[PDB]
């Protein structure tokens, strides 16, 4: 029943000895407060968050306390962690400039929770709140690319192709110059998925075919990409580019193991396909392709 200890924090503010003593007192009071488990603990964290934003405490000590509190923080049940995450996110709003980077980290953690809570709607909104571009503090290229790819994937899983396309365009605006290797492959995968979702089937098939020749990617994912390219080029609008792509896939010996080889045979030679033939081909199509 150590509820009053948070009020003791006020008595820490009266000290005028501006040195490591205040940092140690804050660290030890945080250590004492985190030992609780009930709603008293939730009130404790709350009070701590609403006291950290106070202007009386110096910027450096408050920043250090906030950052180590966040870095040790998330070891609680998910519900209380989400509640306190929302509380601190809405509380640090008046002083975002002085508490920028910390807030960013917190937001990322919140998105992580929505990754395991099966919520692709609010996860994108939470990840958007991070000021990647605006702000006196700028991040590296890799962080921006990873955040944009995560947002694009999250929006894609929510059946919102417009926002996914916008954020993949934002990512590609800076993807050209980068040092990471797997990030380029992930960006190509996300762009191909976005093009597939936007019903640009021939471009998606071209991107998937180009992706299938990559050596870093695993063989199983290569076969999956080839299957996706075949499905996209079968659904693509009839024409000359589609026929050229069909010939290109036909000249590949890996199409035999694919389940849609017969349709490829009947389409490459320009033969009319009966209605009953596509009875089983439409079963393997993606839900958004029907």
């Amino acid at each position: 029943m150590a509820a009053a200890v948070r009020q003791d924090l006020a008595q820490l503010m009266n000290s005028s000895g501006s040195h490591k003593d205040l940092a140690g007192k804050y660290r030890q009071i945080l250590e004492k407060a985190i030992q609780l488990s009930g709603a008293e603990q939730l009130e404790a964290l709350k009070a701590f968050v609403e006291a950290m934003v106070n202007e009386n405490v110096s910027l450096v000590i408050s920043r250090q306390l906030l950052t180590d509190f966040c870095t040790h923080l998330p070891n609680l049940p998910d519900s209380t962690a989400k509640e306190i995450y929302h509380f601190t996110l809405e509380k640090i709003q008046p002083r975002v400039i002085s508490f920028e980077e910390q807030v960013a980290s917190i937001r990322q953690h919140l998105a992580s929770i929505y990754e395991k809570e099966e919520d692709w709607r609010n996860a994108a909104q939470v990840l958007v709140g991070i000021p990647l571009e605006t702000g006196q503090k700028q991040y590296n290229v890799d962080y921006k690319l990873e955040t944009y790819l995560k947002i694009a994937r999250l929006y894609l899983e929510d059946d919102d192709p417009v926002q996914a396309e916008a954020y993949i365009n934002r990512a590609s605006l800076l993807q050209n110059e980068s040092t990471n290797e797997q990030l380029q492959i992930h960006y190509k995968v996300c762009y191909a998925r976005v093009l597939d979702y936007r019903r640009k089937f021939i471009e998606a098939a071209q991107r998937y075919n180009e992706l299938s020749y990559k050596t870093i990617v695993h063989e199983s994912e290569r076969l999956e990409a080839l299957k996706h390219a075949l499905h996209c080029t079968i659904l693509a609008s009839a024409g000359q580019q589609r026929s050229r792509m069909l010939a290109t896939l036909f000249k590949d010996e890996r199409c035999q193991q694919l389940a849609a080889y017969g349709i490829l045979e009947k389409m490459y030679l320009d033969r009319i396909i009966r209605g009953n033939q596509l009875q089983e081909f439409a079963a393997m199509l993606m839900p958004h392709q029907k």
Binding site: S58, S98, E133, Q138
Partner: protein, 338 residues
């Protein structure tokens, strides 16, 4: 050579003059019109204009735009380019500051500090990223308020602040006499963060303020040394190491009620490519005999892999047309002429 006209255009109190200043400016242009190598003069004048307008104020914008207009003649509208942009940026900064003052006086009129912004354009000015130093909480409110106001006025612009090219005034309260300081951002931050507490070590300054080590060393080089009375220290000249115990003396007997320690401004610290371009120009010709200038530039850009700047294109075209390799009646077309 442009240093003379920069000093003549600089603010100098008694240097203030009359229409004969315009006559002397015309005389300077008379000496300039027959001088070759205009690129160096233009670059030096751009640097001088940036120095005069970005930090501090010049003698008068009158003669400034008069000189810009005079250089527009005999050179071309596209040749001047940037300087007109700097002038327009200064005008926009003045207008935006007036509007922000009106807005601040209108709603929640408190005015803790007097902000003065000088918003510039990314391209024209010789910009440079700041140290990303953490600003003390007294000036964060005005930064947020002006950012909100600018976003409300202009949509989708984003402000890229520079905390290395500004000034401020601090009302010192050491003892009797409010010695109004005039400091740069680094010194403002150091003094303000030292205000809460006493005797912070150099590593404490690095942690609390976040200035880069070299810039912080340069800043703490001042506030002492000169006149050996701003701060009394046993070492002289330069001696600063990690863990140094330094504290401002609790008295300031500087014998003038106008303190300016922002003295940092005073104590401030192809042949192969040209051959390839000429060969490309020749190869584009002896084929397309009559060709436009933009078409020729695009053709050379297509035929080359490395980027190359358009200035190289223009200078090589001029050099090789000087050698009677082409001839110039449209002014944007070239015949082969061998």
């Amino acid at each position: 050579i442009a240093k003379h006209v920069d000093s003549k255009l600089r603010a100098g109190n008694k240097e203030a003059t009359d229409e004969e200043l315009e006559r002397t400016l015309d005389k300077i242009m008379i000496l300039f019109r027959f001088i070759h190598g205009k690129d160096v003069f233009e670059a030096f004048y751009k640097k001088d204009l940036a120095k005069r307008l970005l930090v501090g104020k010049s003698a008068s914008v009158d003669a400034e735009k008069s000189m810009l207009s005079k250089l527009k003649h005999e050179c071309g509208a596209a040749f001047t380019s940037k300087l007109e942009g700097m002038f327009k940026d200064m005008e926009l900064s003045k207008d935006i500051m007036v509007h922000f003052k009106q807005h601040m006086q209108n709603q929640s009129d408190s005015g803790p500090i007097d902000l003065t912004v000088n918003i510039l354009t990314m391209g024209y000015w010789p910009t440079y990223t700041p140290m990303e130093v953490h600003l003390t909480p007294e000036m964060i409110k005005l930064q947020e308020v002006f950012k909100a106001f600018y976003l409300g006025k202009h949509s989708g612009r984003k402000l890229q602040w520079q905390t290395t090219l500004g000034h401020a005034v601090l009302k010192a309260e050491f003892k009797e006499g409010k010695k109004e300081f005039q400091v740069s951002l680094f010194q403002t931050l150091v003094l303000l963060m030292f205000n809460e507490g006493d005797g912070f070590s150099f590593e404490e300054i690095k942690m609390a303020t976040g200035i880069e080590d070299s810039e912080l060393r340069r800043t703490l080089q001042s506030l002492a040394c000169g006149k050996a009375r701003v701060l009394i220290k046993s070492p002289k000249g330069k001696e600063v190491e990690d863990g140094d115990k330094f504290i401002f003396n609790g008295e300031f007997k500087h014998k003038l009620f106008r303190i300016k320690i922002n003295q940092i401004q005073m104590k401030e610290t192809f042949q192969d490519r040209q051959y390839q371009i000429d060969a490309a120009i020749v190869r584009i010709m002896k084929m397309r005999k009559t060709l436009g200038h933009n078409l020729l530039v695009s053709e050379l850009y297509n035929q080359l892999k490395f980027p190359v700047k358009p200035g190289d294109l223009k200078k090589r075209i001029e050099s090789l047309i000087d050698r009677d390799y082409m001839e110039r009646d449209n002014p944007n077309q070239y015949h082969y002429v061998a």
